[PDB]
Design a protein around this ligand. Structure first.
Ligand SMILES: Nc1ncnc2c1ncn2[C@@H]1O[C@H](COP(=O)(O)OP(=O)(O)O)[C@@H](O)[C@H]1O
Ligand SMILES: Nc1ncnc2c1ncn2[C@@H]1O[C@H](COP(=O)(O)OP(=O)(O)O)[C@@H](O)[C@H]1O
Ligand SMILES: Nc1ncnc2c1ncn2[C@@H]1O[C@H](COP(=O)(O)OP(=O)(O)O)[C@@H](O)[C@H]1O
Lengths: 257, 257, 120
DNA sequence: AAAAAAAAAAAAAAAAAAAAAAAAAAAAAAAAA
DNA sequence: TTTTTTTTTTTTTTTTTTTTTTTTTTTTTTTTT
């Protein structure tokens, strides 16, 4: 069944180029060449993790000689209430280096060693709100001991937590802020996203004022909502024999959430 | 004594089908196939818990091969003031895997491991109100990390707690409601209940208005209350040498409860 | 330099099929089907190590099922004076499972678990 | 001058981070036959 | 040419101390029209 193949294909995830993504990539590349630490602030379901992650694929570490890998960008997602030891362990795990059983001071020394051996000019920390207040001192300690840029990606809680300590705030003053979709930006994004993700036999008439209206009402500018809504509508539309997404199907999916 | 066997039958619990149960089962099957998080909210004594139990029994784990048995659906019942560590322990023990000792980080790692190895399509959490606010920060983390359709089940209090965090509410936007029985639905439920759950030999027509008024006034549309009343009336009537429910016995029971 | 490229090729390692190796492979397949323990005794500098490694390459890990790797054949090289802890740990690490730091009893149970989950 | 449900100032429950002894058991090995 | 005693050498297994949050329950609300 061809429909089965399309269902399986849609149930996946794909990357669709966007302007804000390119802006973030260029800004972060500038910071990486300057070795200047910074932070990034945005709302949930805006796709900032996808931008931080898509950037790292381009700069994947490649080593041809017998010497160990030289990695320029390392990327870790801390768990809830991640402490100092837990964070160091993740840095070591990402570099495919054997964790040494021992104490926290041993973890600190080992982390400095593995980071000194490789490049690791830029470190992208996601979900920085979850980071425990005790650990930020270690983060900036690393940023000062070695010339490595540190990027703290978080929401408004990141702002709130950072502004409580003077040194951390001084270290991470420069920043980039994400926005939401609206107007022509939103319409162009919907058109581009459907052309990039949907290969349905017939057009969905997305440009129509009414479809844009209901998608705006259900989306509110959050790409993390538009992607899910349109993918579910597509799977359901194809499942009922409709090659294209239809107005009633859109209304149904929007009503469920 | 034949009456003793009948009494044993009446005291033991049984499961019957209802419109709400079938609706929930179809809805949850959809959510499980699409790997989407959702929640179930309704009043107490409406029987939604038994619906979850029946759904689990339908999807029995299958282990044809010598490898780890497939476990499609997981169902956990947290106790009062439940934390993250105990939640992880319950998930681990439900899958017949030993619980290694150590800090919470090890518990998170072990839980992710055992959930990856088995199928673990959808995870259902009964009486979700008992969980602490901090436990949701890990439930949602699992939902984002792996393709599991986490399902929260509880009362109206659940929404009041979920609204405290923007991200938790953003994750769960779909829901199904359970509610009271009334009118023709209530009358049909009573008539069906007399035939299946009760083991009385003759008569006991609860369709009539006189008995319906009693059961309606005492029950208030809650299915669990109805079950209690009918079983007790039948047992007491059998003890009194009666083979059919009589209005006087029905009246006597409800004023004690 | 072309000559240096040829030299770099000659300094490499190659594998050549011999009747000795094929005999060992057929024998090992028989023993695996029979699920019977056995042993191979052979002199030094005979290449039996390479033959066993090639056998391992014949059957690659089968990830075709959705949850575990289901690797049917494992191959470990113990160090000198290999203790029980190091043995269990090598077996565990070969299957991409983290080491549950503890006592040798914990390593024993953990190794049994990962050996049951995988084909082995 | 008489009446008011809402911020500060106080007790239990979990959770995590580090030395510091003590004994057993074995394995080799040098001297002595 | 093996045996006794030494000698070392791993190897393994077990007790005490401190700090930081979260959450909930009374008294105060003086301040306010
Ligand atoms: N550039 C993109 N292309 C395609 N899908 C995207 C993109 N950005 C975000 N998404 C959708 O949004 C989700 C990722 O958003 P998320 O990483 O949760 O945002 P954040 O982590 O910044 O809160 C994915 O499920 C994906 O489908
Ligand atoms: N389909 C059913 N068949 C038999 N008994 C039921 C059914 N649904 C509910 N009940 C009765 O109602 C009670 C169910 O309440 P419960 O499952 O605890 O719901 P809740 O969790 O909302 O309180 C049980 O005691 C059971 O006897
Ligand atoms: N079938 C073979 N193909 C290629 N080289 C071989 C083969 N058999 C032996 N060799 C050579 O012999 C060496 C392998 O010997 P080795 O594995 O050390 O034997 P063992 O360890 O059993 O003494 C390699 O350096 C390799 O070049």
């Amino acid at each position: 069944e061809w429909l089965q193949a399309e269902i399986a294909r849609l149930k996946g995830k794909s990357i669709v180029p966007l302007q804000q993504v390119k802006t973030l990539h260029d800004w972060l590349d500038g910071k990486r060449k300057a070795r200047k630490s910074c932070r990034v602030v945005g709302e949930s379901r805006t796709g900032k993790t996808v931008a931080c992650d898509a950037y790292r694929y381009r700069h994947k570490p490649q080593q041809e000689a017998g010497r160990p890998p030289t990695v320029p960008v390392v990327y870790i997602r801390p768990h809830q209430k991640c402490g100092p030891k837990d964070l160091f362990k993740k840095i070591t795990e990402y570099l495919k280096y054997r964790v040494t059983k021992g104490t926290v001071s041993d973890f600190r020394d080992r982390t400095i060693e593995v980071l000194k051996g490789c490049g690791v000019e830029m470190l992208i920390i996601d979900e920085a709100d979850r980071l425990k207040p005790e650990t930020f001192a270690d983060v900036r300690d690393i940023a000062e001991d070695l010339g490595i840029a540190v990027v703290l990606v978080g929401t408004d809680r990141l702002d709130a937590v950072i502004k409580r300590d003077e040194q951390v705030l001084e270290r991470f003053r420069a920043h980039l802020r994400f926005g939401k979709l609206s107007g022509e930006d939103f319409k162009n994004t919907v058109e581009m996203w459907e052309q990039m993700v949907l290969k349905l036999p017939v057009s969905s008439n997305l440009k129509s004022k009414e479809m844009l209206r209901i998608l705006t009402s259900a989306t509110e500018g959050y790409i993390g909502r538009l992607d899910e809504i349109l993918r579910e509508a597509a799977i359901r539309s194809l499942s009922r024999g409709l090659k294209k997404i239809d107005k009633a199907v859109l209304q149904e999916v929007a009503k469920e959430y």
